[PDB]
């Protein structure tokens, strides 16, 4: 008797089952990357100058 | 640095347990992996 | 008496150690509304319910021993005859079936529902029919009107006469303006909007006047009616040797008293069906339908300018609805308005919505007993729910933003389904030891799913299907929606009794569910407890004495009410490119996700004096909650705004006591009372990363480690005779100093807290010839809330079109200098002087039956006997609060739908 | 009815 | 035996008039398919079924005494103990709760069910269990093997070295090419195709051949497989002193032979219950549930490349589907493919599909008898069923056209309900008469309503909710339908009775339905009967005759089977300028739409000889359809192009009959058999406005006045041995003289009937000592058939690269002049050629069973017996049908799904 | 399975 349920309409974190899971979740990560280290972040460390 | 150490942790259990179905998408998995790799030093570096 | 608590075979009630409370059949049947816990508000000693609204299709809130946790649910586990339902399914069963329920609310009661029964757990017993020569049959019919509990704040309010000149001189409409030229021509000017609307051009002026001035308008009876209500029930209660069998089949439609449609309507079958088929074997099913067509009132706890009970104290006395015939138009006029407004029930006829729920319960078990004690038992149940909404709204109406119509559908199933099985085994090891031992398994599974489809741009009433509307831009996405649960569980326990005054039970349960974290899964729980006669033992016997008892127990529960999917880092949508999608993790969930530990430790003791006359019994509970749930704020390592993870403890330590009596006059009068009360004091023993206070952002209240969650706001010390502006008193600074610029540093915590300490009620019945007469009261003392309402109709500026109080008349300004109330250039914020105290004592229902004697049934071999019963249900209220009603609500009471007042009349034939 | 929101209510 | 014909009390079997046939819970009881009127093929003399498909999820055709319209539908009323029922609830229903099944036939017998019965009415009647001391428990298990009937028309076709050398010599590959070269090179270039997919680019050559041509591949084994079969079922029947009850709770799992799946699946539950209350009142309820999950197979009937029976004749055997270890791969290979075609466990994977029907019925009724004669019984009864499905198309697959996927949702909900309230008297005037007066009400209501909503253009597999797509241009509009009718009616029936000898009843019905025109909504039926018993009153007594019956009758019924809503005439939309739109008359219907009024004459005689050894009866009826129902095509003054209106007549005359038999050898031995049989031959009386013959467009048949309705087609003459080329005769022109040009002028009646006359079927069975063995046969004669797969199996031009038959060898050509076979460049049409003789005799089971002896459970007070059986369904058919099965179809087959042979084995524990 | 309709069939 198995007895956990993964969320229907969205996945989660765990270890990838295909190849399109893995496609996919590097291409989130660059997303991330773009908003992470933008201009935006390092006028600080010009401004201080 | 913690979604690139989740990505790169999780690329590396599925190349551990063989889940990929052909010789390409090993071969495309590695390049993935080791594009992660070089976000998790970047990610680091800047915080040093 | 013999309770079932749990499972297995029932025991004694006065062998159990763990303070139960069974209410019998009398006090649940004949009650004219579709809640059936709404009946035991003041029955139940330490048990709190509490109906928010005044709906027919409304759900009370039930708290036993206080409110046990901030951050997760505090409902108990309603259970019936086996498998466990909701508030709604019960809602959809007819309340002459119950047999008994029993509530459960001390530990080695309610710890074989552990992870399940932190908060108590009810226990609802359904009628399993008597075994005799020839069966019986019971028609029941009722009859009955409703309406509002009370007018009074009404009895504040403007008129027309005097809003005019407040208005004027508060310079609204104008800075030269003046009565009898506002009055004459600014807004009688209603014919400028009533004259481009075809189907009211030619009426104004001779069938109806929107804007009167010659006398007030009544907006109760223009937002308020008095609703009838039906009911009735025929049932065959039948057995014989070893078959026994109780079917029923009911009807029930009650509606709502506001002018906006709400009803609750249903119609109903039950059949239990229990018969043993041979020496060893005995099944049995209980088999239950329902067929429910529910409505409710959406716009009540939102302010819009019309409607609800702010549209009674708010809406101008000059304003008219009604025609010159005394029944309510199509439409009325405020002013500056684009189009006319419609009343209730034309929104009610070009907005129309219709709801049909099938529901089905099949609960069957069979239960073998081959050796002289062994029993096992198991136990399979289905409950399934579809239901099927549709709403439009209606096409070509001229009183609207556009002439097109629209229309949505929505299709919903709840499955759910439950095993159980348990062997039991006792037996006596010597003339005076006994011992019993039961052990079992248990499998809940929840599956559920809603569908919804919606279409727009209908030209025509008739082609009104959902293929029939605009494409293009006129049509969108559908609704999707899909929940699920499972619980695993092992339990086990042991009741090792004494000859006749020690007995002493101990147990365990093991409880396994999808929604504890994958780190800890298993959970473990525990009881002990004892019972001790004392009057079987030392004192043999005695002239005032006639029982004693002592019990003590100590457990622990836990309360998995944390949701179903929130221990797990769920990955959502982020695009990288235009073609391909991209998934980034969103809430990074936790894999140590508890089940919110609690345990209580229980002393209480029951006497019984005159011979069973007299019975008190007094209990003593400290209950500790520990590993709360609370969305934290996190840390910047995380790279997460918060975690959700199992912080903080809380302790409730209280006192209940409940008395019953027996008073007589004669041999045929019969009098009788009884009386219990609750008190439970609260507080906040820790909290996160080493805080001291925590405020939840937007709320109203507090959390300080020490004391109960109280309100957090702005303490308020009236108005100066100097310059007329509102002082708020400041946090600390003591000389107390008062400023009048408010800001936010001025908020503090209150020393009124959140949920009431105080909880009780009394009853008292006399009976006489067959004719009684019983009356149950019942009282909550300590209960603060915020009354919404009066931000509107006692504000000085702003918001200077609606109707306002009488005290604004008395205004602060140079020739008038000793009033209460501030000038009309300012903006009351919320602070202290919107608590107010909702305290109440009520009146439950007054019933009034008589049975008719057997003497008139002689011949007749048909008619067995009859009763006929007078009941009155809210009947007074004793209060301080001005708000229409002291119950609805909690926190905050806004634009609200009152508790109302009903008459009922029924008979009841036992042909 | 509708017809404005007319609100500056506190949260419940 | 006793049966309950209509309504009231059953009277008897040797009194009724109506010859009605009652089958017993033998034949029902224990048979491996979903449909239980298909273990129904030659019992019930005059009555034909024929199952057209071979699903678990198909449905049985049952036509009794010929086809009576040409117009509408033909299947019987099928109502299941009161209240009516379609065969798809009967399916979710558990076979061994049916306690008998009358078929009703004649005229008064069907008679008090006008409006409905003019197809028969076949009656379920539900089992009440027995009234004894101690209940009895019964436990069922079965388990077989389903596969694919015979394997025929695979020895005929060519092979892959045969069908290349046929391929090249007809140019189909090069005008100068050969084998070698096209073998070699242009068609073993699959690696072309294989190169591009990264899955099976490493993998051609190595573990996976698409061209193999050393030796030929076996489809069959690609797209058809051995299916497995489960069921078991716990029944609880028992009783007492007026109460019993019957209960049962099942499980049938059957999956489908042929590769793409079909399974149905269900879970049951009944509870039949019936006590009496007092001395005059008795109720009862009949409670039943299902949880049941289709699926079926949609592509059979229609010709794609590669599934189906049609992939198995024609896909090329030099293609191989399967790896190098013979197992079936994900993808073959076809020439010119741009895109690799999957296989079917592929497919099947791609395209998931899931159905979950919830079904409930509900019936009650409750009888009172005061008086010694009077009965007055009233019941009710819902029928609930639920209905949701979904289907969705999985993204990113690399062998398709976008790697966008796709979702449905579809909900459905049908409705129904019935109420009907009777009155009955019977009473002896003197001492040698008797009469019986029955009169009654009836109402019948049914609503149901489809909702769906689809969504396309997700990218993930695990984001598949219908909320997800994408929006723009990739959504559409729902699906929403809705239809519902009513009836009301009153009937009555009088049963007047001599003392043993005369029997005569008269009955009468008025109904009112939704269905009929708004100028005659009103239907007047009646029915008169009488039966002789010449045996007690004219010869006392004889040595070899011991029973003589004679009965006739004569009855009016009707057959309102018509649509919903085909009296009316449907505005639509039609447009005028871009803002508004318009509505116009789009079907004119007609108010006086009848409800096609036939009436029955019915003469017969029952005999019984040897002390009720032999038993024979013979039955002659005439059976005249009236008003029947065509879309006409109306005069130009009409201003439309139908009316759909009733015209015309149509007559079956017929005889059946039936033996039964029993032989015997010791005490011990018992040998029985029986055989009946039913000729039927029909004509068309008259027609449309004063026509003849009238064909019904693009169908294939003609409806002639004075003959059956035949096929239309061309004739037939063979090849001329000078040029070779196809002749078709010529209607009419004796000299007959044939022509090698096809027009439309060439075709004429066929001499062969659409629906078969000579229907039948015999039994035999033997019993020794507890073992016994029957066997049932069934036969059909006279049905002609188009066998479409012939289109494409033996063309000599056009679709050329199928696999052909192995008689396109001996073509037609200068050197060889001497065949049946003509060119290879011709295309052949649809003519008498195709038409087949599809007559057939089938084994229907073979079962050999075993009850072990009563002297082993001797002991043991447990078990109380036990019962082995095997059983084969379908063990041999012979026929002359050249398409996998005759059955499978009518008026023409295509590509089928074969009836399949079942072998189950199966036990049954009395304990 | 799909691919093609390759029909010349006859009403049914």
């Not at chain 3, 529960?557 to 235009?578: D, K």
């Not at chain 3, 996190?634 to 409940?658: E, R, W």
């Amino acid at each position: 008797c198995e007895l956990d349920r993964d969320p229907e309409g969205k996945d989660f974190q765990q270890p990838y089952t295909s190849f399109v899971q893995t496609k996919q979740n590097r291409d989130g990560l660059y997303a991330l990357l773009r908003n992470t280290e933008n201009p935006r972040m390092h006028f600080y460390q010009e401004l201080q100058s | 640095n913690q979604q690139a150490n989740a990505f790169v942790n999780n690329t590396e259990a599925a190349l551990q347990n063989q889940v990929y179905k052909n010789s390409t998408e090993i071969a495309n998995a590695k390049s993935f992996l080791a594009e992660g790799k070089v976000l998790q030093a970047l990610a680091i570096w800047r915080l040093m | 008496q013999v309770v079932v608590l749990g499972y297995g075979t029932g025991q004694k009630l006065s062998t159990v150690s763990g303070s139960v409370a069974k209410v019998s059949s009398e006090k649940l049947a004949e009650k004219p509304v579709a809640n059936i816990m709404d009946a035991l508000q003041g029955q139940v000693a330490g048990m709190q319910v509490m109906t928010t609204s005044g709906d027919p299709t409304a759900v009370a809130s039930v708290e036993i021993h206080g409110t046990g946790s901030l951050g997760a649910s505090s409902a108990p586990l309603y259970i019936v005859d086996g498998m466990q339902t909701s508030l709604d399914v019960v809602a959809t069963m007819n309340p002459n079936d119950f047999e008994s329920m029993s509530v459960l609310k001390d530990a080695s009661a309610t710890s074989i529902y552990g992870a399940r029964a932190a908060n108590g757990v009810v226990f609802i017993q359904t009628k399993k029919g008597k075994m005799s020569e020839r069966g019986r049959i019971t028609f029941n019919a009722s009859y009955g009107i409703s309406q509002i509990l009370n007018t009074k704040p009404l009895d504040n309010m403007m008129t027309g006469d005097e809003l005019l000149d407040f208005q004027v001189k508060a310079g609204f409409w104008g800075n030269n303006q003046t009565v009898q030229k506002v009055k004459d021509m600014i807004l009688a000017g209603a014919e400028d909007l009533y004259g481009n609307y075809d189907s009211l051009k030619d009426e104004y002026g001779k069938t109806l006047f929107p804007v009167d001035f010659n006398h007030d308008a009544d907006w109760l009876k223009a937002l308020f009616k008095t609703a009838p209500t039906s009911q009735g029930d025929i049932s065959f209660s039948g057995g014989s040797q070893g078959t026994s069998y109780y079917a029923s089949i009911g009807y029930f439609d009650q509606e709502g008293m506001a002018r906006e449609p709400a009803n609750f309507k249903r119609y109903s079958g039950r059949l239990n069906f229990e018969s043993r088929i041979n020496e060893w074997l005995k099944v049995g099913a209980n088999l239950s339908g329902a067929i429910a067509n529910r409505r409710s009132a959406d716009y009540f706890g939102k302010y819009y300018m019309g409607s609800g009970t702010f549209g009674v104290l708010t809406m101008p006395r000059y304003y008219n609805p009604f025609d010159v015939n005394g029944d309510l138009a199509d439409v009325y006029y405020m002013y500056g308005a684009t189009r006319p407004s419609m009343t209730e029930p034309y929104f009610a006829k070009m907005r129309p919505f219709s709801s049909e729920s099938h529901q089905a319960n099949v609960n069957g078990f069979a239960q073998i007993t081959p050796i002289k004690g062994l029993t096992l038992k198991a136990q399979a149940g289905v409950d399934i729910t579809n239901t099927r909404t549709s709403s439009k709204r209606m096409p070509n109406n001229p009183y609207d933003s556009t002439p097109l119509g629209e229309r949505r559908e929505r299709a919903y199933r709840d499955v759910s389904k439950s095993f159980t099985n348990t062997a039991e085994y006792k037996f006596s090891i010597d003339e005076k030891h006994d011992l019993t031992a039961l052990m079992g398994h248990e499998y809940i599974e929840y599956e559920g799913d809603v569908i919804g489809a919606s279409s727009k741009g209908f030209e025509s009433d008739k082609l009104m299907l959902l293929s029939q509307g605009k494409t293009g831009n006129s049509l969108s996405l559908p609704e999707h929606r899909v929940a699920e649960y499972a619980y695993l569980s092992f339990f086990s326990r042991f009741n090792y009794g004494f000859d006749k005054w020690m007995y002493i039970d101990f147990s365990v349960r093991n409880d396994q569910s999808s929604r504890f974290g994958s780190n800890n899964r298993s959970a473990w729980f525990y009881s002990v407890g004892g019972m001790f006669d004392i009057y079987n033992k030392f004192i043999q016997e005695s002239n005032w004495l006639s029982d004693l008892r002592l019990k003590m127990s100590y457990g622990t529960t836990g309360n998995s009410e944390i949701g179903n999917y929130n221990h797990q880092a769920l990955v959502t949508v982020n695009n990288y490119t235009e073609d391909a999608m991209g998934l980034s993790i969103s809430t990074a969930g936790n894999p140590d996700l508890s089940w919110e530990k609690q345990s209580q430790f229980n002393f209480g003791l029951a006497a019984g004096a005159f011979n069973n006359r007299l019975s008190a019994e007094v209990d003593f509970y400290v209950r500790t909650t520990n590993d709360m749930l609370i969305d934290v704020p996190m840390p910047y390592i995380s790279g997460f705004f918060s975690q959700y993870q199992n912080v903080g403890s809380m302790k409730n330590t209280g006192v209940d006591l409940s008395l019953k009596g027996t008073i007589y006059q004669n041999k045929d009068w019969n009098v009788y009372a009884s009386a219990n009360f609750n008190y439970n004091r609260q507080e906040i023993t820790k909290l996160f990363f080493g805080l001291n206070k925590y405020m939840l952002p937007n709320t109203g209240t507090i959390w300080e480690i020490g004391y109960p969650n109280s309100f957090y706001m702005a303490e308020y010390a009236g108005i100066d005779k100097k310059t007329g502006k509102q002082l708020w008193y400041v946090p600390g600074q003591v000389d107390k100093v008062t400023t009048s610029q408010y800001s936010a540093d001025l908020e503090t915590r209150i020393d009124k807290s959140v949920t009431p300490p105080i909880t009780g009620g009394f009853s008292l019945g006399a009976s006489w010839k067959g004719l009684s007469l019983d009356a149950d009261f019942a009282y909550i003392v300590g209960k603060w809330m915020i009354n919404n309402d009066r931000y509107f109709t006692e504000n000085g500026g702003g918001l200077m079109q609606l109707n306002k109080d009488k005290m604004l008349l008395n205004a602060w300004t140079e020739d008038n200098k000793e009033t209460d109330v501030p000038k009309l250039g300012q903006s009351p914020q919320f602070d202290t002087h919107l608590l107010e105290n909702a305290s109440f004592l009520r009146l439950k229902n007054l019933k009034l039956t008589y049975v008719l004697p057997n003497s008139l049934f002689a011949g007749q071999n048909v008619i067995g006997g009859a009763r006929v019963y007078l009941m009155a249900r809210n009947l007074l209220t004793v209060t301080k609060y001005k708000g229409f009603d002291p119950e609805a609500g909690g926190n905050v009471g806004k634009n609200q739908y009152p508790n109302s007042k009903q008459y009922v009349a029924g008979i009841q034939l036992s042909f | 009815g509708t017809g404005g929101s007319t609100g500056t209510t506190s949260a419940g």
